[PDB]
């Protein structure tokens, strides 16, 4: 038997409860590949799936965790054999299916990627969906003409999970990074990832009546959304793009069409969940090459399965800095 | 001396009046190239500059008209000489600078493009800023993977200027074009341009509480904006893109970020005004090749300078179908 985080729900009442529990192999859903999980992580979505559910989990009891990395235990699929190191992000694992907060996980072989060269299973989850999303965002900006030397790139929610990898990848590629945070004590941490400028959240988290402001940002990785994304749109330089990745600041988008029409701005939707295999390999290769491992190490916060109920709650309130690494075998 | 439409402003009350007037060459602002204008047209913005101004005109008296085409009369720039057929769209002509609603116009040589192969000056203005914008929208969707055979492409405000041209281009390139209109009597016109479905404005002109609806549209050219654009974002297929082109339905964009995050949807800003020389040539070549001239002809509504006050009022109310062609020399 083995350890896993299990969420139960009281349907009469609707309340949920998450606890570490012992399971057997036969309690897992059947699948092509069985992985002995070595590491997982905590994303904002995991926070939802650990606690309230946010309408993302449709079957209880539930093992959350949208990410994991580990070693293949058994497989009925040619692509993977016992011993192979593999990473799982997204594919609705941790939401529609049992996920990574477990010493063992069963998945479809289509959902896995080989462990990328230059990362171990621990760093792969230090990156996680948050870091993978950050790389997809940077790639979207590059595909739309972003190159260093044409103004600061804004990174909202910069001290969080997506923001910390975004900041470090962009800094390492040679960009000037303007890191947004509502908590000024995070400045030294952000500067140590490579932030050049620190923007206060309260400068930029309300809409204003003017549909256009002074052109400032050469690009943006938006891990916040909400009113702040609406306000940010009116401050992008002509022809610059914003990569939308986050909704912690709220799902609503109180924007105007004026930045798009008058300044040729783009709002680019970043989805990590359903990324095709080939693009997953490309983004992971870019992370291997463009995210300095010592910068990733400075983000890492260790945790066990027992910590997950507290960490899940904390990340929903924006009180988790950097990237949590869950040693499911600790 | 020669004829032009002049708008006067009564800055006390703030109300304007437009009328045909006789100018001399010396009344025109100085510039590098003098063009004997042959044709202009009526864009939504021209309606603003003809009438109330919409914050776009900062010096009266004002000759409006953001577009014109004709023959170079004199030139102090080596790029153009007497006799060259030239086309003007945008560059803030008709807004910041006296425009095409005149038998003669002075411009910077930087603002002109040679008359494109396959169009005469009349057809260039039947296309106009509106059609130029529609091609840029089609090009933006292509650059993001739009290709025939994967669903209908929505064109909002289909019976207007941008919408008519976009419809005909997309239909000629082999797409199924879903054409939005509030005027059901215009179905036969839209079918004649190549629309394969007619969609009623009232089905899609309000937001709904759900942030995602069923995936329908392979892409969109949006000449309306406002609530309709917010509603359309939630109906786009995974990874599909919207080319934002218009604001006749309102400048406010009451959207959510959910389509961008969950479906990888893009909102691509189309700016015609400041497009660089090289891309203008590319887009005009595409128009000459992919807008069938007989479809363009079916859009044409003839007009003279004296028609401009009424048409300017008409286009602001959504009461102009197709594309006006102004013979400034009739
Ligand atoms: Br923030
Ligand atoms: Br419409």
UniProtKB/Swiss-Prot annotation, chains A, B:
InterPro entries found in the cross-reference section: Acrylyl-CoA_reductase_AcuI, ADH-like_C, ADH-like_N, GroES-like_sf, NAD(P)-bd_dom_sf, PKS_ER, Zn-ADH-like_protein
Enzyme category, top tier: oxidoreductase
Catalysed reaction equations from the record: propanoyl-CoA + NADP(+) = acryloyl-CoA + NADPH + H(+)
Inducers of expression: By dimethylsulfoniopropionate (DMSP) and acrylate.
GO MF terms, alphabetically ordered: acryloyl-CoA reductase (NADPH) activity
GO cellular component, one term: cytoplasm
Compartment(s) where it occurs, according to its Swiss-Prot or TrEMBL record: Cytoplasm
Subunit structure: Homodimer.
Purpose: Probably catalyzes the NADPH-dependent reduction of acrylyl-CoA to propanoyl-CoA. Restores acrylate resistance when expressed in an E.coli strain K12 acuI deletion.
Family indicated by similarity: Belongs to the zinc-containing alcohol dehydrogenase family. Acrylyl-CoA reductase subfamily.
Protein name per Swiss-Prot or TrEMBL: Acrylyl-CoA reductase AcuI
Organism the protein comes from: Ruegeria pomeroyi (strain ATCC 700808 / DSM 15171 / DSS-3)
